[PDB]
Design a protein around this ligand. Structure first.
Ligand SMILES: OC[C@H]1O[C@H](O[C@H]2[C@H](O)[C@@H](O)[C@@H](O[C@H]3[C@H](O)[C@@H](O)[C@@H](O)O[C@@H]3CO)O[C@@H]2CO)[C@H](O)[C@@H](O)[C@@H]1O
Length: 366
């Protein structure tokens, strides 16, 4: 009959997913419907919302790995069949990212590490140290999704903060590091980018920063390959560079995100589903996704290809990978995303960095 795929990746990559799915259907006979969920107001967790009522898709494509802890815990994901995944074809952290309680629940398709996207017309040579960064930010502007933990964690970790303690590949949900002296130092710098450097105002966010960058108004912003298409469409002669070292001289620690594909536990055609997932996540598929958006392949063999090794996106990626922190995928991580709004209060000056940190962790525990 028909197999439904929900994709949280849009633009050129979605076009490729549709092309691959159509080629798959040509051989298998099953009609494949690909739905774009990238703009769904319910976000990534909409999968759980839908699956909980038995209205989910057969296959999910383009889901950031942190979300799967919830889905797996609630029994909404079919475990990856034996053999489908060869752990040796990926970096260690990539496979750990798709395991929940030791079980592999999804297939890695891409790896992501946020970086600074800059306009070469304004910033010919990218900054690498905080001092150089200040000079370029002052001269041509800097903005980003400042109150979004996904991005500002780069500063938190750079100062020694952390979400959940990672000891022996196992995260400890009870050991939170978002209220430590280091984390407070980071929150203070976040506030300072508004109150001291004046690069942003309390209202500045990701949407505004992207719009400003596409208009050629700011020389730098923090983003990822999901913006490649729009940046090129805006005809910006862009470059990609790692986060600069911070005021403490340490490297920023952006999160490592693994984009995944998986199968609904309730799907009636799971064998066919996994075959489709394999087609959507093959070396060739990843080559296509990279070609059209610069999304870094999860497969090491594709990363080692000439097109990838020579790209600016990959260069920034390999220069930050050792400092990147895999996002926690346990269910409790959603409570963290849900409480990060307090970062906005700190950045606005409504609450001190010290008090805000305390409230952040308390709101997370809740
Ligand atoms: O902000 C909370 C949010 O953080 C993490 O999400 C990030 C994604 O992991 C990352 O890929 C990127 O999301 C982009 C989608 O991949 C892309 O297809 C398209 O939809 O645009 C998105 C950005 O607008 O950035 C987000 C952070 O904004 C984490 O994985 C989420 O579960 C969490 O809710």
């Amino acid at each position: 009959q028909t197999i439904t795929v929900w994709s949280w990746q849009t633009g050129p990559e979605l076009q490729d997913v549709k092309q691959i799915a159509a080629q798959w259907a040509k051989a298998h006979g099953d009609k494949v419907i690909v739905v774009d969920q990238s703009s769904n107001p319910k976000g990534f967790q909409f999968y759980a919302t839908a699956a909980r009522t038995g209205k989910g898709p057969d296959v999910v494509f383009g889901m950031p790995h942190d979300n799967n802890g919830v889905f797996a815990e609630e029994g909404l994901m079919a475990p990856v069949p034996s053999g489908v995944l060869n752990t040796g074809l990926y970096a260690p952290n990539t496979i750990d990212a798709i395991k929940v309680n030791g079980t592999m629940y999804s297939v890695p398709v891409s790896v992501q590490v946020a970086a600074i996207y800059y306009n070469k017309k304004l910033v010919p040579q990218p900054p690498q140290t905080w001092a150089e960064f200040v000079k370029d930010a002052n001269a041509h502007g800097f903005m980003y999704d400042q109150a979004n933990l996904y991005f500002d964690y780069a500063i938190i970790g750079g100062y020694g903060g952390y979400v959940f303690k990672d000891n022996n590949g196992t995260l400890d949900p009870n050991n939170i590091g978002l209220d430590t002296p280091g984390a407070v130092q980071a929150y203070t710098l976040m506030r300072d980018m508004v109150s001291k450097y004046h690069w942003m105002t309390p209202s500045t966010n990701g949407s505004i920063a992207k719009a400003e960058f596409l208009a050629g108004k700011i020389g730098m912003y923090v983003s990822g390959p999901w913006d490649t298409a729009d940046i090129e469409k805006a005809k910006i002669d862009f470059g990609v560079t790692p986060w600069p070292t911070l005021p403490n001289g340490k490297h920023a620690t952006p999160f490592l995100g693994v984009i995944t594909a998986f199968v609904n536990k309730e799907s009636k055609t799971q064998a066919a589903d996994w075959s489709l997932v394999q087609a959507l996540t093959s070396a060739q598929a990843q080559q296509m996704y990279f070609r059209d958006s610069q999304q870094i392949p999860a497969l090491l063999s594709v990363q080692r290809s000439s097109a990838v090794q020579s790209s600016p996106t990959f260069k920034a990626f390999v220069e930050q990978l050792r400092y990147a922190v895999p996002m926690p995928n346990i269910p409790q991580m959603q409570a963290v995303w849900q409480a990060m709004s307090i970062l906005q209060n700190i950045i606005a000056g409504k609450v001190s960095p010290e008090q805000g940190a305390k409230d952040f962790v308390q709101n997370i525990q809740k």
